Amino acid sequence: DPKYADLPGIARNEPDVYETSDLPEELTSTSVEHIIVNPNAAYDKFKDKRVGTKGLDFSDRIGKTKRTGYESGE
Amino acid sequence: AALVVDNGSGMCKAGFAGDDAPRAVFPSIVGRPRHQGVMVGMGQKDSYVGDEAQSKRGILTLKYPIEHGIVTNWDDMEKIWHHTFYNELRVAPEEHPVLLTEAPLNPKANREKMTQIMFETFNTPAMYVAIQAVLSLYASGRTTGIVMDSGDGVTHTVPIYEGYALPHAILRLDLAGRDLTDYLMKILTERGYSFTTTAEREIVRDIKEKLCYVALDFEQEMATAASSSSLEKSYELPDGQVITIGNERFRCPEALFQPSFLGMESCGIHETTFNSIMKCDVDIRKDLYANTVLSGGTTMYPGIADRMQKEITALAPSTMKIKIIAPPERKYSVWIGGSILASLSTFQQMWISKQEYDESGPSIVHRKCF
Amino acid sequence: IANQPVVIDNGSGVIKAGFAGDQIPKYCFPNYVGRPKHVRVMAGALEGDIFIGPKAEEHRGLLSIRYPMEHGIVKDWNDMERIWQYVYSKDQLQTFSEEHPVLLTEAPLNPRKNRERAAEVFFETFNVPALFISMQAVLSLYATGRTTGVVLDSGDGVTHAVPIYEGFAMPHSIMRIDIAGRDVSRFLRLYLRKEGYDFHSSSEFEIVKAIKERACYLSINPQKDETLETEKAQYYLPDGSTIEIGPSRFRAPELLFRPDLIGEESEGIHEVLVFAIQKSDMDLRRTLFSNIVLSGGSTLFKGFGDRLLSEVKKLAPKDVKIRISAPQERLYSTWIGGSILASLDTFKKMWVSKKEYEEDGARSIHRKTF
Amino acid sequence: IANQPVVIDNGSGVIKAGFAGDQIPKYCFPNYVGRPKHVRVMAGALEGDIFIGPKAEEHRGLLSIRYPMEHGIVKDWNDMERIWQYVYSKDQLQTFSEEHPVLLTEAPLNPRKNRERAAEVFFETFNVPALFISMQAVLSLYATGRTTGVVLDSGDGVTHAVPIYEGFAMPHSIMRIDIAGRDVSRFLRLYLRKEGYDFHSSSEFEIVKAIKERACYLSINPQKDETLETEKAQYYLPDGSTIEIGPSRFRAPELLFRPDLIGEESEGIHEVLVFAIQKSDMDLRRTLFSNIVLSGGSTLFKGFGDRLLSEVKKLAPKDVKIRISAPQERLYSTWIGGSILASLDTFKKMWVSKKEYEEDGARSIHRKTF
Ligand SMILES: Nc1ncnc2c1ncn2[C@@H]1O[C@H](COP(=O)(O)OP(=O)(O)NP(=O)(O)O)[C@@H](O)[C@H]1O
Ligand SMILES: Nc1ncnc2c1ncn2[C@@H]1O[C@H](COP(=O)(O)OP(=O)(O)O)[C@@H](O)[C@H]1O
Ligand SMILES: Nc1ncnc2c1ncn2[C@@H]1O[C@H](COP(=O)(O)OP(=O)(O)O)[C@@H](O)[C@H]1O
DSSP, X not given: OHHHHSOSSOOOSSOSEEEOOOOXXXXXXSSSEEEOOOHHHHHXXXXXXXXXXXXXXXXXXXXXXXXXXXXXXX | OOEEEXXXXXXXXXXXXXXXXXXXXXXXXXXXXXXXXXXXXSSOOSSEEXXXXXXXXXXXXXEOSEETTEEXXXXXXXXXXXXXXXXIIOOOTTTSOEEEEEOTTOOHHHHHHXXXXXXXXXXXXXXEEEEHHHHHHHHHTOSSEEEEEEOSSOEEEEEEETTEEOGGGOEEEXXXXXXXXXXXXXXXXXXXXXXXXXXXXXXXXXXXXXXXXXXXXXXXXXXXXXXXXXXXXXXXXXSSOEEEOGGGGTTXXXXXXXGGGTTOOSOOHHHHHHHHHHXXXXXXXXXXXXXXXXXXXXXXXXXXXXXXXXXXXXXXXXXXXXXXXXXXOOXXXXXXXXXXXHHSGXXXXXXXXXXXXXXXXXXXXXXXXX | OOSOOEEEEOOSSEEEEEETTOSSOSEEEESOEEEEOSOOOSTTOOOOSOBOTHHHHHTTTTEEEEOSEETTEESOHHHHHHHHHHHHSTTTTOSOTTTSOEEEEEOXXXXXXXXXXXXXXXXXXXXXXXXXXXXXXXXXXXXXXXSSEEEEEEOSSOEEEEEEETTEEOGGGOEEESOOXXXXXXXXXXXXXXXXXXXXXXXXHHHHHHHHHHSOBXXXXXXXXXXXXXXXXXXXXXXXXXXEOTTHHHHTGGGGTOTTTTTOOOOOHHHHHHHHHHTSOTTTHHHHHHXXXXXXXXXXXXXXXXXHHHHHHHHSOTTOOOOEEEESOTTTHHHHXXXXXXXXXXXXXXXXXXHHHHHHTHHHHHHHOO | OOSXXXXXXXXXXXXXXXXXXXXXXXXXXXXXXXXXXXXXXXXXXXXXXXXXTHHHHHTTTTEEEEOSEETTXXXXXXXXXXXXXXXXXXXXXXXXXXXXXXXXXXXTXXXXXXXXXXXXXXXXXXXXXXXXXXXXXXXXXXXXXXXXXXXEEEOSSOXXXXXXXXXXXXXXXXXXXXXXXXXXXXXXXXXXXXXXXXXXXXXXXXXXXXXXXXXXXXXXXXXXXXXXXXXXXXXXXXXXXXXXXXXXXHHSTHHHXXXXXXXXXXXXXXXXXXXXXXXXXXXXXHHHHSOEEEESSTTOSBXXXXXXXXXXXXXXXXXXOOEEEOOTTSTTHHHHHHHHHHHSTTHHHHSEEHHHHXXXXXXXXXXXXX
């Protein structure tokens, strides 16, 4: 205020701002069956399931016939 | 009896089918005077076209109707065709069928409006649109090979094998001759020589064509250009005033190989050709390397082939042999193709007649493209 | 281990991160590194040359977008490592990488060198206690809570179908195609240029992706809707400009069912599903048709289920019950599966320890990974 | 040296001097040298043949005004050195150029020789400890106290629009036009001669500038004020004589927004602002419309903001918020910005020492510019 009050080439009794007025489907298909995912229930179903990781090797090794990973959940 | 009319953004090349060179070659520009309410003298035309607009640059506002190979002002485009047919060629459009040229991957609206005007406004007996890149092969008599037809509006690379096009391999870049002119104006202004107006823009374009050349090694040429003043050449303007272009001479054409200078955020023209070949089939790549054709007038820069050879060779395999095909007559290579194709008796069947247009509609052009 | 394992869904579009037990992924951000292309002049301006996640989304206009991974294969490893560093940073999980075990979910039938290098980072750069890599299809079954089912997981990067029966997976019946969500966005961009809308910039391509998600429907009969005059559905761009998408809405996404449109010699998404089942034993084929599970974001197109069911019905045998099941959280199904598997005590035995990796090396990852 | 820096605004119209500690420029005088009209060979006449600022104002009728700077470019360097010597005189500031560093405000996109020669003067003619040239647009943002914002700086010599976002200046979107406050004074002098008031002498050109500064309003509808009979407002000269301005008052500055009316090949002041925003990325365009800052002396015209807002609104996209935040001290904003920048601790790194200039060479000023 005192800064531009001293100066001659200053806008006085003029508006500062010139501005404009302030202005203020597939998941619902019939064909597909819709499943609701409940992870709490899914955990309970798979909770006590186990796998046999002894002798496990998925790799493309030819030696020693065919292999099947995860023997049993004993 | 047929007419070949290339609708270039820079220059309009028109003539009769079978001719070696185009009969009428003039700039595709309309010049309207900056007239005030003050009275003007006699012999005053509301809108000047071609050589007249180039002669009276001082007062006339020059507006190109084609921007990046797209017709922005169709009313002015009709006036270019009207001057081409009636004045320059001295032939009625009702007599001869007209062969037209389109850039690849252009807006569908161009073909739709193009055919409407020729059949309705000019009442031509037949009209056929051709791809500029495909025509350039007829000029070289080659069925196999890629073409780099770089115009004033856009640059495109269309690989064709044994007369079969790979549409997925087609690449379009908006970088072209007109953008280089605007770049040259800016860097000349930084040197001292200021060019602002539309008339001055055309004078700078005429200067560019004379002095500018492609460097083999950009950094080494600029380092040598900085050291010695042997590359520095003088140019005489329409006025007595003389200018010394200096290092900016060879700096302008670099943008084609490094678009980062202009700020295109795209790959260079040498990278576009390589990228297109990589999109192409593995078997035919060898033949595309053997037959890399340069077309259009934007490849008339001295030593562009030398820079292209080095850059493509670096990108290409070490075992592969890279051969660039750059004939002396590249500028009129597209039109000559049109003349050869129009002359061919086989093409006689390809023409779309007025009757066919009336029966089908303007959609007929989309069906008979490729 | 007392510290919860971190689930990292390394998707091409968006990376979904969180701890095991969490109901939904807490931290989901786009999978790309944005670098500022414009020059910094003022003092107090934006700090850093690297922007990842919401900072990149906020100030996208300044940045140049660059995806490090394409079709589930890491192109730039330096960028991919920095994003994994960002997952652990104060903005994301804000935890030590050496304290928590990691569960990575890669697409099936990826290169061995990609898996080897990816693992090396999590043992060398990050001192992780244990790493286990899992398949996308297997995790989707844990989320759905079913041991038997065919999982058609059409992602942004890759589309694959893995038939799994009562836990057993037939590795020879797995079908993978590179064509995915990102290819439709590029294919739509082709139609936008033909209509006359330019989106050259990496930021403008992200707007094309937003346009695709907003306005694209899958036609039941493609040739019928292609011929019929389409309603020009208007979309409002971020700046305020309106674009008419028109026929491109349904012509672009058709790529998923017709790969010949781009010109790739591959099977359609509908052929991938049925062919994968046909490879399976005669006895199980009817059960696999009965248990079909959709996954991935690229299935969210309007009329996907209607079009897919029509195409599967034509290819499938007569008098077979075809039941297509869609989880409501299609996008989040894969991650939720990871959280469910990771929460299980059986997961502890599945781990490859840091010590185990150091002794055996890359072999340990190939031996224990599927 | 720790001594406070001296800010000097290189305004074609009025030079604004002062220290970085000062809140406002104390010393503001016209940027021209005043010499006696009659060539004085004899003694007993005006001695020194140099009158600057108040000395020129005292003997205004006797002297002949010659501006050394035109469109932000120095024509006569000898005169400019005398003006800069007057800045470091007993009359104004009264300090040693050897003790205090200097901050200059060079116009954008000037020739490199103008920048190099200007620097040479302050190191060779003046033995300055340190010199730093800064951008006029960037300084305005420091004065306003915002990083993001469009700066439409309409000066006496040059009018230029620079869009800057988060302290990043887009060099490709910058637009510069030579039609500035000086040209409006020239056009008003022509219109005043059409009213029947001759201003033949160079001293009388200052009275045309005084008339413009006192009485000059921009009409919202020019046709209504042209049709309406004017009050014919009288202006009083120092001698006592009156001038009836009439319709020339408002119909003179119209050429800023419509320079095609007189016949000047330019876009216009409202056009250069809109185009400069349109060049920027789609994400930023909306933010640039919502954040516009007016700078320079040729914005003090009565009803300037009202006319500009209307002309921008019609060109700008629909349903977009346009906020033109003008300060009260637009005329003195550039110098205040320089004082703030000089006051910042970051400036300590920005300026180049005299010793560094002696060793490195002239090129030094170009590399440190940005
Ligand atoms: N000898 C040359 N040296 C430098 N630049 C050149 C030269 N010849 C042509 N050019 C540039 O190339 C541009 C187009 O070449 P031109 O000779 O107009 O062929 P064109 O086929 O008419 N282009 P188009 O208008 O699209 O058909 C010109 O505007 C120049 O910028
Ligand atoms: N509503 C939608 N309609 C159409 N496509 C969509 C929709 N939402 C997302 N997409 C597409 O799906 C992609 C998301 O892929 P996503 O499933 O997250 O990948 P991934 O499984 O590899 O992690 C998006 O990038 C987009 O291409
Ligand atoms: N109150 C005013 N009304 C109208 N025009 C003015 C007013 N004050 C100054 N001007 C014009 O603006 C010019 C001042 O430009 P200025 O802001 O000093 O330029 P710079 O930014 O280069 O220093 C004057 O010469 C005059 O033409």
